[PDB]
Ligand binder design. Structure first.
Ligand code: GUX
Ligand code: CL
Length: 458
């Protein structure tokens, strides 16, 4: 029988306001070697992005950003015209790639088709300041100030000391000197170039020193998050993925403190469940939908300006999989992002759970929509417990529910939202209508184990 929990919504308990460009995706820079991928001709992928949000941010970076070499006279290889660059697996050095004017031109058209903004990595790991300045100038020329949100100078510079990009002694002080050299060169070509950083993988010690040094030179602070811990941890499981992550909480507190010290907001510019491209049986499953949707809300509630789920190719954790030649599909994680998209923007409200110790991985978020209607996003991440949620603090004549479902937490397919899969080119509309039982001030929602729900009140 279900665990009977209470949820009290408090319309006076005002949280953060979710911005319209919160959602986003991250891709490997190597993908820019193929001018057909981020292209106005890529209508399938553009549709998948639009379904994730009418505003949002595309970030391009990752390990391959140290292996991409812009040149104004470059041409893609024949193989480049067909490249599908999935998440770098981190086992050895990435292949060298060139980036061309054509690809940047086509990226511009892709951003126009999607309505999304751009965070663009520059090659601080192996490239030169002058080449970065030239690349930045072309990007600014072509993409424009309104769509270019920030350049980033290197990806995960806190890992250069161990991945061959720099010697073992590389540290924040060394990075700060590299950053300044690149910044100076770029600003000579592009005096209005916007920056974010430090784009770190994990090392929270770099946040303070970076922000204090470069606070007048950046628009926002960026860092990364993977749910999987260090290599010496036990292998990630779905059970672990559903549970709170104290490292996340600490990282988020570090970022909040930077904002308190400097005024700079923060964005989680690369995230996913498990590293090395993901873990088959965890990252590519329905549990990842629950994980991702919940993470989006947790971070929004903490004051993040947005998020960018890493992906590409057919990587285990990619939200969207596919290629221009074979087409694109929504993977399970996409459906958690879709729940967020459908909820929309607005101000988060207090949403306190009680009587929930037997269903501790249920999370709930309440929102006053931009349209004035109350929504509640719930993630029943308990893998073995169904819940019955008694909802107080909401007065409405009618509420509806859209369910986020799969038959098993580990399913790699069979994921639906609102009773429907996402179709080709991101097409989605709900096919199952359900009213929330109960009435004004006392609604009652059942949720099966390992499921999610979006409630909308009239
Ligand atoms: N503690 N400690 N240090 C050990 C390092 C572990 C932390 C992150 C390592 C994996 C990061 N690695 C993430 C990703 C992946 O491995 O899936 C890959 O595709 C992207 O290109 C990278 O930017 C980033
Ligand atoms: Cl806060």
């Amino acid at each position: 029988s279900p665990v009977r929990v209470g949820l009290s919504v408090d319309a006076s308990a005002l949280g953060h306001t979710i911005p319209p460009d919160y959602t986003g995706l991250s891709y490997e820079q190597a993908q820019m070697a193929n001018p057909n991928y981020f292209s106005g001709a890529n209508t399938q992928l553009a549709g998948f992005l639009r379904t994730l949000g009418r505003q949002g941010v595309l970030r391009i970076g990752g390990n391959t950003s140290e292996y991409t070499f812009w040149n104004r006279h470059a041409k893609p290889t024949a193989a480049d015209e067909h490249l599908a660059a999935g998440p770098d697996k981190g086992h050895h050095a990435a292949a060298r790639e060139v980036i061309t004017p054509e690809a940047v031109n086509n990226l511009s058209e892709f951003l126009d088709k999607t309505g999304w903004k751009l965070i663009y990595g520059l090659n601080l790991g192996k490239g030169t300041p002058e080449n970065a300045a030239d690349e930045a100038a072309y990007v600014m020329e072509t993409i424009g100030a309104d769509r270019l949100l920030a350049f980033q100078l290197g990806n995960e510079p806190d890992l250069f000391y161990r991945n061959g990009i720099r010697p073992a002694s590389y540290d924040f002080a060394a990075y700060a000197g590299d950053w300044q050299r690149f910044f100076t060169a770029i600003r000579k070509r592009v005096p209005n170039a916007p920056f974010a950083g430090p784009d770190t993988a994990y090392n929270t010690k770099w946040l303070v020193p970076f922000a204090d040094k470069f606070k007048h030179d950046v628009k926002f602070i960026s860092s990364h998050y993977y749910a999987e811990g260090p290599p010496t941890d036990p292998s990630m499981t779905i059970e672990r993925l559903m549970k709170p992550n104290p490292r996340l909480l600490g990282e988020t507190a570090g970022l909040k403190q930077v904002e308190a010290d400097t005024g700079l907001p923060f964005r989680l510019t690369q995230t996913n469940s498990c590293y090395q491209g993901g873990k088959q049986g965890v990252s590519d499953t329905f549990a990842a939908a629950l994980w991702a949707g919940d993470l989006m809300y947790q971070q929004a509630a903490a004051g993040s300006t947005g998020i960018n789920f890493h992906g590409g190719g057919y990587g285990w954790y990619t939200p969207v999989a596919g290629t221009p030649e074979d087409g694109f599909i929504a993977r399970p994680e996409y459906y958690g992002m879709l729940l967020f998209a459908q909820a929309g923007a607005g101000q988060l409200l207090g949403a306190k759970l009680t009587d929930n110790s037997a269903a501790p991985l249920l999370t709930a978020y309440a929102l006053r929509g931009t349209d004035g209607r109350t929504r509640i996003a719930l993630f029943n991440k308990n893998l073995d417990a169904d819940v019955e949620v008694a909802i107080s603090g909401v007065a409405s004549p009618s509420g509806t529910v859209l369910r986020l479902e799969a038959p098993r937490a580990d399913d790699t397919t069979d994921v639906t939202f609102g009773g429907a899969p996402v179709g080709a080119s991101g097409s989605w509309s709900p096919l199952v209508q359900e009213y929330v039982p109960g009435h004004s001030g006392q609604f009652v929602l059942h949720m099966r184990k390992a499921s999610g729900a979006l409630l909308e009140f009239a």
